[PDB]
Design a protein around this ligand. Structure first.
Ligand SMILES: [Zn+2]
Length: 273
DNA sequence: GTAGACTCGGAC
DNA sequence: GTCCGAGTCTA
């Protein structure tokens, strides 16, 4: 899940937990808890607090409690669900927050890559991982000017640049390949090789791509759904991601797949320069 | 500052 | 064996 996915999860999860008081916190896979490092302390400090709100920062969910903030990252396959405490638990449930009303917030993650950090509300923003996060793509803090700034200070590919959460928040593998194709730029291009026109173009497309995505509930390509288990629909609007060997939707040239910045990369050798 | 290797487990 | 909507730790 990237910005669009997490944003949908956020909007649909809030009403299901807002105003509930944590009665217990059960942990079946301690490694997910990053801070405090001792899982017993993590659990003990949550008890008695009420869920006041749910915010997003890049791909992170920020649960606002009374004095604390629970920072959660789903990474590759983490997922939330609110259900009854009387029902058996589905497989791969690693952390459960029990509310005083008998319902509970369950966190599932087949790969166990997800993380959880709990800090006093005022410390959350000045501590990792929210600490070195770049600006929100959909906000003025993210402008062509800002992007140009980081591009020159490096020889690495533009794809590696965009995947860097310190440059811009929330862009992942799918939307990077998709924005580069829309901007007509090869992902392997050195970040510096880009020009002023190419930079403002990329910015334009990043904002539109990410934008259309949230408005469609995200991209379900394998295991993503909102807290209601509903599937997004932006994956029907994908130009390159996951379409290797298939004709480009614009020019008909077969989409190619390579490894760039250590990850699967899709692009149209004809339309992207 | 930056290329790699985990952290893990189920679907082809 | 290969593939994977992520991002911190290495060397
Ligand atoms: Zn094309």
């Amino acid at each position: 899940p990237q910005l669009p996915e997490v944003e949908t999860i956020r909007r649909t999860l809030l009403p299901l937990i807002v105003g509930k008081t944590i009665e217990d916190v059960r942990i079946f896979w301690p490694n997910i808890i990053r801070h405090p490092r001792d899982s017993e302390a993590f659990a003990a400090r949550m008890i008695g607090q009420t869920v006041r709100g749910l915010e997003r920062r890049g791909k992170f969910l920020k649960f606002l409690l009374d004095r604390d903030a629970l920072i959660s990252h789903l990474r590759m396959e983490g997922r939330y669900a609110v259900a009854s405490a009387l029902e058996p638990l589905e497989p791969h449930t690693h952390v459960v927050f029990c509310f005083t009303d008998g319902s509970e917030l369950r966190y599932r993650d087949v790969r166990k890559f997800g993380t959880m950090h709990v800090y006093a509300k005022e410390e959350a923003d000045r501590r990792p991982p929210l600490a070195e996060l770049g600006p929100e793509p959909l906000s003025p803090a993210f402008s062509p000017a800002v992007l140009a700034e980081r591009a020159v200070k490096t020889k690495r590919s533009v794809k590696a640049l965009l995947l860097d959460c310190t440059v811009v928040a929330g862009f992942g593998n799918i939307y990077v390949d998709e924005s580069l194709f829309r901007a007509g730029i090869l992902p392997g291009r050195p970040a510096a090789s880009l020009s002023s026109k190419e930079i403002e173009r990329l910015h334009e497309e990043m904002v539109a791509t990410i934008g259309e995505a949230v408005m469609k509930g995200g991209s379900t390509v394998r295991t993503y759904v909102n807290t209601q288990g509903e599937a997004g629909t932006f994956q029907h609007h994908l130009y390159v991601y996951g379409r290797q060997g298939n004709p480009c939707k614009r020019c008909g040239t077969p989409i190619e797949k390579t490894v760039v910045a250590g990850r699967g990369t899709h692009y149209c050798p004809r339309c992207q320069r």
